[PDB]
């Protein structure tokens with residue numbers, strides 16, 4: 001479990017396989033016996049020559065807590081499975097992403113960073129109070145919730161194979177992606193590296209297209 | 217172009233094929249010649265016996281304007297293509313879905329429907345004014361936008377084949393789906409029926425799983 | 433490992449999760465604690481009301497040995513991952529599916545079933561001898577192999593989630609599917625039932641569309 | 649319609665959109681008005697920076713006649729739609745790919761190229777005669793067909809968007825792909841270039857990974 005932003009997290013729930021799962025699929029192997037030099041070279045060969053289907057046989061399930069504006073970017077990754085909390089069927093919790101003053105580093109703002117912080121807190125507080133007043137007046141939850149801002153936290157389970165995960169890292173562990181999702185992608189990368197060190201290193205060396213994971 | 221909700225729309229931008237596209241794919245036909253009785257029966261046979269791959273050769277592109285809370289449900293349909301306006305790269309417009317008083321029919325509310333309406337307007341107005349104040353103070357748009365509520369309108373192009381479209385109609389043209397997306401699904405159905413009448417009628421008769429399209 | 437046909441097999445290589453994986457994803461649960469009555473009812477509710485995305489969080493990897501004509505049907509299942517032996521990069525083994533005389537039960541043939549059996553053996557033997565003569569004359573393997581018949585055995589790893597697996601069972605564990613792939617689908621079903629008994633029983637009761645698994 | 653190999657073909661059956669379809673989707677444009685300089689630069693920007701989702705809004709349907717060994721490679725492309733002739737439900741035609749003597753250029757063979765050619769013809773003739781004898785004895789077609797070699801011609805309709813098509817060209821219009829499928833990929837490229845010249849040129853310049861289309 002890795003903490004992200006002020007109240008977010010990424011947690012690994014389950015994993016199928018490891019580096020050897022890709023090697024075994026690539027060879028269609030009967031062997032369930034590790035030979036680092038040979039297996040590692042095959043992983044590098046596959047990665048450097050674009051043969052990534054074998055990495056689809058490694059699968060992760062994560063539990064993620066993130067603001068809706070981050071989730072909407074994340075859920076654009078179609079080659080994966082999602083299940084998310086419903087604001088139709090339950091009351092949504094009072095939890096919002098409030099950027100730290102540091103979030104505005106490099107931006108000259110005509111009001112102080114601390115005042116930006118508090119103005120965001122103020123509007124989310126008003127919006128949640130309206131949500132609650134609507135709920136408490138008998139407005140159905142599926143309608144009441146529409147006044148809640150995009151920095152509201154949500155949670156989801158994400159099941160994804162290592163190939164689609166690498167695509168996600170190319171796009172999201174990268175400076176062009178929004179900073180907030182970058183932070184999530186760094187945590188995803190860290191877990192991927194822990195479970196699949198040979199694949200991760202080969203990925204970085206041969207296939208990774210982004211500009212942050214080689215710098216951290 | 218069909219108007220939906222207070223400010224939304226669905227518009228057909230382009231289409232490839234028609235009922236005969238499915239028949240020709242099913243037969244792997246060299247013929248590019250219509251025989252209603254024969255072609256229509258083949259469509260019904262395919263539909264009633266679950267052989268839906270031939271309908272994937274009919275493709276639509278729609279332009280949709282809908283609130284974000286509707287779009288987030290819609291974008292869960294992974295077997296399709298989407299491109300959506302960015303709140304990272306442009307200023308988002310002042311346009312929100314405000315439910316009509318009629319939206320609360322059947323719900324006894326402890327405040328009048330008209331007061332629910334105005335309370336929703338009030339909070340979206342405050343949130344947008346905060347968004348603008350943040351933008352105008354030099355806060356990057358990608359951060360400023362997080363205070364905007366889920367009833368903010370967005371727009372997207374949606375490219376989808378008739379098989380995935382039929383899945384969308386099963387799930388969204390149905391009473392269990394949120395009323396707001398139901399309204400969009402009715403418009404999608406109407407366009408589908410216009411362009412593919414034989415497939416649509418066969419769908420309704422043999423494969424449609426929902427409970428509204430047989431009643432309208 | 434389950435033997436299929438004369439020389440085929442299905443073997444489970446790895447699995448992620450079990451019945452509880454779907455329940456936990458459906459609830460977006462922090463709990464990693466089994467409550468049969470409650471969890472089983474949720475599985476049945478999901479299955480009977482068409483909410484099958486939670487079953488995507490259960491994943492299998494199988495190693496399959498089957499004739500090419502069976503593999504070509506199987507590989508039409510796009511929502512899954514495959515890696516297969518290459519006849520471009522290695523010599524293919526002398527192993528063919530020869531139907532038993534029993535395979536023709538119900539068919540009056542103008543030559544005896546045993547003679548059908550031997551005529552199939554004879555032609556595959558001639559084709560393989562030609563393949564070998566071409567290989568041994570320096571014809572590249574990728575070209576030599578084109579003379580080999582469709583009953584040649586191949587092997588592949590198949591990674592598939594429980595939702596796509598259930599689709600596969602609907603279509604292939606069914607009398608309309610070719611008998612030879614039916615036999616494979618029965619083995620897949622047996623493994624699925626072993627690992628996911630609650631999901632399998634709910635599937636049979638509420639969602640399974642075929643006509644053999646309720647009869648065996 | 650483009651002839652391929654000795655008896656194969658690729659034919660465009662239908663297309664949705666053109667270069668402007670991608671531009672319009674990328675901008676979520678209301679405009680249905682061409683501005684070459686501006687639209688072409690946007691296409692290049694998208695292509696060079698990996699933003700390829702807009703090209704998914706361009707869709708093709710092809711009719712392809714190819715040998716089974718080519719089709720089995722082609723059908724590995726999961727992000728597309730296929731419908732193919734059935735050897736379960738109809739008699740398969742006597743049509744086989746026979747390599748020309750030129751196919752063996754660069755390979756020293758211990759029998760003459762012309763003799764390789766005739767040995768392939770001989771075995772396919774024997775296999776087809778066996779197929780026919782089995783059919784004519786009352787063996788079901790789905791069983792009789794298993795003796796037919798992989799160079800048997802088949803036909804299919806293929807519906808694919810420009811993004812998946814570009815992936816197909818990266819992998820198949822390339823020297824590592826089997827020569828026979830390369831020839832098909834060259835024809836696909838030619839049609840793609842005809843219908844989408846700006847996208848094709850941008851693809852070649854910025855995203856194409858193979859080593860033949862820049863040389864022809």
Ligand SMILES: Cc1cc2nc3c(=O)[nH]c(=O)nc-3n(C[C@H](O)[C@H](O)[C@H](O)COP(=O)(O)OP(=O)(O)OC[C@H]3O[C@@H](n4cnc5c(N)ncnc54)[C@H](O)[C@@H]3O)c2cc1C
Pocket residue numbers: 076077078079080164167171172176177178295296297298299300301302701704727809811812815
């Ligand atoms: C910096 C940045 C800015 C962005 N800006 C915008 C924006 O302004 N508007 C917007 O709408 N989106 C935007 N996106 C989202 C982007 O367009 C993709 O939806 C997202 O990056 C997921 O990428 P993907 O399609 O590769 O992932 P997945 O959907 O997981 O697809 C994985 C791979 O499968 C293939 N694939 C899956 N489905 C299909 C298909 N139907 N056809 C062809 N290939 C398929 C592709 O090879 C793809 O790479 C942005 C993303 C980034 C990183």
Ligand SMILES: Cc1cc2nc3c(=O)[nH]c(=O)nc-3n(C[C@H](O)[C@H](O)[C@H](O)COP(=O)(O)OP(=O)(O)OC[C@H]3O[C@@H](n4cnc5c(N)ncnc54)[C@H](O)[C@@H]3O)c2cc1C
Pocket residue numbers: 079080081082083084085086292293294295296380383387388392393394485488511593595596599
């Ligand atoms: C009434 C209702 C309530 C809902 N409540 C919730 C909720 O509380 N939480 C929540 O997160 N979502 C919820 N959803 C969304 C739902 O779980 C699906 O994401 C959505 O309905 C799209 O369905 P789909 O997967 O069939 O569509 P698509 O993603 O377009 O898939 C089309 C078909 O392709 C197949 N498919 C595609 N990808 C895969 C894959 N990876 N594995 C296996 N098969 C695949 C399936 O056969 C699927 O039917 C709800 C939907 C409805 C209609």
Ligand SMILES: Cc1cc2nc3c(=O)[nH]c(=O)nc-3n(C[C@H](O)[C@H](O)[C@H](O)COP(=O)(O)OP(=O)(O)OC[C@H]3O[C@@H](n4cnc5c(N)ncnc54)[C@H](O)[C@@H]3O)c2cc1C
Pocket residue numbers: 269272295377379380383508509510511512596599603604608609610727728729730731732733734
């Ligand atoms: C009895 C029988 C006879 C058959 N005869 C023929 C034949 O004569 N010719 C022939 O070519 N094939 C034939 N097939 C194969 C059949 O057309 C399908 O390719 C196969 O059954 C796989 O089904 P699927 O598409 O549901 O599986 P998958 O490809 O695994 O798809 C799973 C689900 O995802 C969705 N999905 C995936 N991709 C797409 C997409 N691109 N668009 C929309 N939805 C998508 C659908 O909801 C689908 O049900 C036959 C199959 C059977 C069982």
Ligand SMILES: Cc1cc2nc3c(=O)[nH]c(=O)nc-3n(C[C@H](O)[C@H](O)[C@H](O)COP(=O)(O)OP(=O)(O)OC[C@H]3O[C@@H](n4cnc5c(N)ncnc54)[C@H](O)[C@@H]3O)c2cc1C
Pocket residue numbers: 053056079161163164167511512513514515516517518724725726727728812815819820824825826
């Ligand atoms: C030279 C060469 C040699 C080959 N040798 C072999 C071999 O020996 N054995 C063998 O079995 N195959 C072999 N193949 C086939 C290869 O492994 C792929 O199946 C094929 O090239 C299609 O590529 P694709 O997966 O990118 O295409 P598609 O299946 O069309 O996928 C398009 C894109 O969508 C994404 N995608 C789709 N589905 C998934 C998923 N489930 N998970 C993650 N991402 C997904 C990926 O981004 C992918 O690039 C070979 C191919 C080539 C070109």
Ligand SMILES: Cc1cc2nc3c(=O)[nH]c(=O)nc-3n(C[C@H](O)[C@H](O)[C@H](O)CO)c2cc1C
Pocket residue numbers: 025026027042045051052053054515521824
């Ligand atoms: C997806 C995939 C693609 C492959 N592509 C090639 C290839 O282009 N050339 C090759 O000689 N072997 C290929 N192989 C076989 C094998 O991995 C490789 O030849 C050697 O193992 C490298 O040591 C491939 C295997 C797989 C699973």
Ligand SMILES: Cc1cc2nc3c(=O)[nH]c(=O)nc-3n(C[C@H](O)[C@H](O)[C@H](O)CO)c2cc1C
Pocket residue numbers: 241242243258261267268269270608731737
């Ligand atoms: C996807 C698909 C599935 C088919 N399934 C069957 C089948 O189960 N049985 C059959 O006799 N013909 C099948 N056919 C062939 C054909 O459509 C059908 O036999 C007749 O055309 C019905 O008039 C199929 C064709 C396609 C494209």
Ligand SMILES: Cc1cc2nc3c(=O)[nH]c(=O)nc-3n(C[C@H](O)[C@H](O)[C@H](O)CO)c2cc1C
Pocket residue numbers: 083089392457458459474477483484485486
């Ligand atoms: C994919 C999915 C779909 C759901 N659909 C519904 C629904 O249509 N109605 C509902 O009341 N709850 C729905 N729920 C919530 C929940 O599973 C259900 O209300 C109760 O748990 C049943 O006991 C859904 C949950 C998921 C994960």
Ligand SMILES: Cc1cc2nc3c(=O)[nH]c(=O)nc-3n(C[C@H](O)[C@H](O)[C@H](O)CO)c2cc1C
Pocket residue numbers: 176299305673674675690693699700701702
């Ligand atoms: C899929 C997609 C990705 C985009 N990515 C970026 C980006 O990384 N940076 C950016 O400034 N604009 C991006 N844009 C917006 C726009 O195309 C671009 O800023 C200008 O139009 C370039 O002239 C993107 C648009 C789309 C549809």
Ligand SMILES: O=c1ccn([C@H]2C[C@H](O)[C@@H](COS(=O)(=O)O)O2)c(=O)[nH]1
Pocket residue numbers: 069072073074076176177178300301302303304305
């Ligand atoms: O960095 C980005 C920018 C946009 N998008 C997608 C997500 C959503 O469907 C749409 C608008 O996203 S927004 O730009 O973050 O508002 O485009 C992303 O997925 N990532």
Ligand SMILES: O=c1ccn([C@H]2C[C@H](O)[C@@H](COS(=O)(=O)O)O2)c(=O)[nH]1
Pocket residue numbers: 084085086087088089285288289290292392393394
């Ligand atoms: O009717 C529904 C309910 C939920 N969902 C999906 C959309 C979103 O990813 C998540 C939460 O949606 S919400 O319930 O409308 O808040 O679940 C849907 O797609 N449709």
Ligand SMILES: O=c1ccn([C@H]2C[C@H](O)[C@@H](COS(=O)(=O)O)O2)c(=O)[nH]1
Pocket residue numbers: 501504505506508608609610732733734735736737
């Ligand atoms: O039962 C069937 C019949 C056909 N097919 C697909 C497989 C192949 O791509 C094509 C022809 O298959 S054959 O009918 O077994 O020759 O259609 C299947 O996938 N299953």
Ligand SMILES: O=c1ccn([C@H]2C[C@H](O)[C@@H](COS(=O)(=O)O)O2)c(=O)[nH]1
Pocket residue numbers: 516517518519520521717720721722724824825826
């Ligand atoms: O060039 C290649 C080599 C292999 N394959 C796939 C196709 C088939 O499912 C399997 C074996 O193909 S074969 O090598 O052409 O026999 O791997 C390809 O798709 N392309």
